[PDB]
Design a protein around this motif. Structure first.
Motif, PDB file in Angstrom:
ATOM      1  N   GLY A 104      35.828  40.694  38.858  1.00 55.79           N
ATOM      2  CA  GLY A 104      35.941  39.279  39.184  1.00 55.79           C
ATOM      3  C   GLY A 104      34.818  38.395  38.687  1.00 55.79           C
ATOM      4  N   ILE A 105      34.432  38.535  37.422  1.00 62.83           N
ATOM      5  CA  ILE A 105      33.377  37.719  36.831  1.00 62.83           C
ATOM      6  C   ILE A 105      33.973  36.814  35.762  1.00 62.83           C
ATOM      7  N   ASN A 106      33.275  35.715  35.472  1.00 56.21           N
ATOM      8  CA  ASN A 106      33.718  34.768  34.453  1.00 56.21           C
ATOM      9  C   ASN A 106      33.381  35.273  33.057  1.00 56.21           C
TER      10      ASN A 106
ATOM     11  N   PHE B  17      39.480  34.111  43.663  1.00 56.63           N
ATOM     12  CA  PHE B  17      38.775  35.395  43.608  1.00 56.63           C
ATOM     13  C   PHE B  17      37.629  35.373  42.596  1.00 56.63           C
ATOM     14  N   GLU B  18      36.906  34.256  42.537  1.00 59.13           N
ATOM     15  CA  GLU B  18      35.745  34.112  41.668  1.00 59.13           C
ATOM     16  C   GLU B  18      34.486  33.994  42.515  1.00 59.13           C
ATOM     17  N   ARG B  19      33.441  34.721  42.122  1.00 52.03           N
ATOM     18  CA  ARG B  19      32.226  34.872  42.924  1.00 52.03           C
ATOM     19  C   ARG B  19      31.146  33.955  42.358  1.00 52.03           C
ATOM     20  N   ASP B  20      31.109  32.716  42.847  1.00 53.96           N
ATOM     21  CA  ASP B  20      30.154  31.717  42.368  1.00 53.96           C
ATOM     22  C   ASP B  20      28.841  31.895  43.120  1.00 53.96           C
ATOM     23  N   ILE B  21      27.919  32.651  42.526  1.00 57.15           N
ATOM     24  CA  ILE B  21      26.626  32.945  43.129  1.00 57.15           C
ATOM     25  C   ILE B  21      25.478  32.312  42.350  1.00 57.15           C
ATOM     26  N   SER B  22      25.778  31.445  41.388  1.00 56.04           N
ATOM     27  CA  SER B  22      24.736  30.803  40.601  1.00 56.04           C
ATOM     28  C   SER B  22      23.971  29.787  41.442  1.00 56.04           C
TER      29      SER B  22
END
Lengths: 118, 48
Positions: A104-106, B17-22
């Motif tokens: 699940g990463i961009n 389902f995207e992990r925005d941890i920036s």
């Protein structure tokens, strides 16, 4: 770079390893054989989110398909004995599904890693 | 309790389902974020 998380898949001829971390990449990464003697993959690794290993397991062709479907990373594989040098051997045969993962990463860019014999 | 956080600023929407941890600095105007917090360059994290 260290700004965003990233996926690493590596094989050491006996184990396959998957890592999903905010890596800082050495922009010239390679593996080196003298038996291995060089492992220049990442500059740093921290804040791990997923890690997986496997059991300790031209001449051949291996074809794969890598895709992303709303967080599902899908990997399809096939293997065949090939003796030719430069052609694409017609005679298409059916591919198969191999792996699904929730990394699940961009993902927008990718690169391949080599092994250099020295 | 301020050990819980939520992001406040992002320049675009998210896919499921995207992990925005920036934690990068957000540009709220036409002034570039030169690696430092400032006016229209808020830290995109807020405390519950």
């Amino acid at each position: 770079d260290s700004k965003t998380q990233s996926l690493l898949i590596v094989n050491n001829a006996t184990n396959v390893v998957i890592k999903v971390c905010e890596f800082q990449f050495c922009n010239d990464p390679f593996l080196g054989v003298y038996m291995e003697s060089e492992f220049r993959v990442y500059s740093s690794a921290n804040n791990c989110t997923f890690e997986y290993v496997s059991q300790p397991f031209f001449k051949n062709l291996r074809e794969f398909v890598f895709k992303n479907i709303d967080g599902y990373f899908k990997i399809y594989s096939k293997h065949t004995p090939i003796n030719l040098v430069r052609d694409l051997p017609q005679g298409f045969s059916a591919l198969e599904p191999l792996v699904d993962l929730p990394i699940g990463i961009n993902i927008t860019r990718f690169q391949t890693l080599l092994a250099l014999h020295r | 309790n301020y050990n819980y956080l939520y992001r406040l600023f992002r320049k675009s929407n998210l896919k499921p389902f995207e992990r925005d941890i920036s934690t990068e600095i957000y540009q709220a105007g036409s002034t570039p974020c030169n690696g430092v917090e400032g006016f229209n360059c808020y830290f995109p994290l807020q405390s519950y």
